[PDB]
Amino acid sequence: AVTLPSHSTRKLQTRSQTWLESREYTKHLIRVENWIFRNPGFALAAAAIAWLLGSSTSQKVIYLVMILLIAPAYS
């Protein structure tokens, strides 16, 4: 398959546990760092661009994250 959409996005809030919450939240973490632990360089570079913005000492702040958050998961 190509694109697989997540039934995650639209779960079903009930008292009984979801299909597999466990192993859910640990994956996004795994990837978004198991990515920077491979193509870490993108860090320092990605960081620069986060500097070339509204450089608010509380804004560059966000941007830095907006970039490293996206790279990892292709979007």
């Binding site: 995650s8 996005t9 079903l12 008292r15 299909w19």
Partner: protein, 504 residues
Amino acid sequence: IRCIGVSNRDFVEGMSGGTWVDVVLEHGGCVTVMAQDKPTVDIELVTTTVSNMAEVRSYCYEASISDMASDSRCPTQGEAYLDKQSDTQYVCKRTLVDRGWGNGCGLFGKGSLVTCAKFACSKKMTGKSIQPENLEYRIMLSVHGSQHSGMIVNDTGHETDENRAKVEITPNSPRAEATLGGFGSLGLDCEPRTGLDFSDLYYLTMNNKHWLVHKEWFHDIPLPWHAGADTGTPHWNNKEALVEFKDAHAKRQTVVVLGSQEGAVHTALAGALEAEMDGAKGRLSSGHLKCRLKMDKLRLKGVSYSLCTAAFTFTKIPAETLHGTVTVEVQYAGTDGPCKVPAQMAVDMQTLTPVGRLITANPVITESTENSKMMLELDPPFGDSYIVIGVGEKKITHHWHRSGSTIGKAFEATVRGAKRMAVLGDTAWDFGSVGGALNSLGKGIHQIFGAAFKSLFGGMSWFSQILIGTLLMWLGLNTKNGSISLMCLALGGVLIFLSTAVSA
């Protein structure tokens, strides 16, 4: 007797004003009931079966190509043909090949060929469509009569009896009447509709491991397809997401069958509900159903018996369970009839005023001439009590200790509502068994929110919503004003919460 230790039992305080047992049965934890006028019964929405369903679509998660047929034509003509492009039975794709003198083509470059594959299928994910109406629940309920660890365990032999009854509201017979005599009857004004909105809940079936899956997500994943269809020769639809057309270099066009997807549909399938099937009906769990019972028809048998005098004994030493409600199991002398079993757990011994509550309600030996081990509850007041159950000459007293101050209960029963809220959204202002101003105003105020906040945030798994909330709380106190920036750290406070509030 049931609902004791369901890690999530909820004692619905009656009301000396008409029977409004407006309680939302959970398909998981449970809710027990108590009012002066009646014994104390409780319910556990046990089975939630779905009758019939529609086979909207079928997908294949393990295709299998068979015949690789290739055709070619040089720049001399337009395209290729190939015997198979006129069958649904296959899947073709045409492009170019550096057609030159390699094949002896007058003209050079430009060619165009087309390879195909006969598209079979190994395992298909058979989804379904279950109209909200035609389903059905089965709420079993028990009573704190004289039971003896007869709790849970056997249920069918128990239902042909007066204390354990099994009713079942259909979206068609929405007001079942559970008549457990010796006590009375029970009203049920259930809404076999506002359940889990099985509207957009196609019921999956991926190799006998079915999960109730949201509608959307069902149409959304593409691979093969066949449905509302008489199987016959499954004329598929799509198929690209399985046969892979990659032409090696630029002379030959090869096609491989992309891999099953079998479990990549299991990671896809990251929704919440897990279903079980009989084949007949859609037996499942995890759901909710809002009702209303009639307390009127339920007689306290006990207050007519002469309290029992003789010996009592703790066959089962008192066990505190889930927030300070203690079960004691005791047996009797051995030559008595249907009589009350006195029990006032008190502050002290002499001025034994009865202090605390008596979940059990009316405790009464079954008309037995044998040591009846009657299993019964009680709610000790925070601190040190004395579960004393006897005549008074021989008080089989007991030293008890409930470690829960009243303030430390309010803070922790604040969440027994915090979650029953964020799991029941607004059907949370439904436990409010009454027509109150705020029980009503609520179902309404936190309504244009359940509707709003959800519409504009109904697409983001756990992680994803913290990532927004935390971003909002920063948008919080940190900003130009504290005006339209309070509601930022406000609604942003919900998301951060909702994510962690479902977990614990």
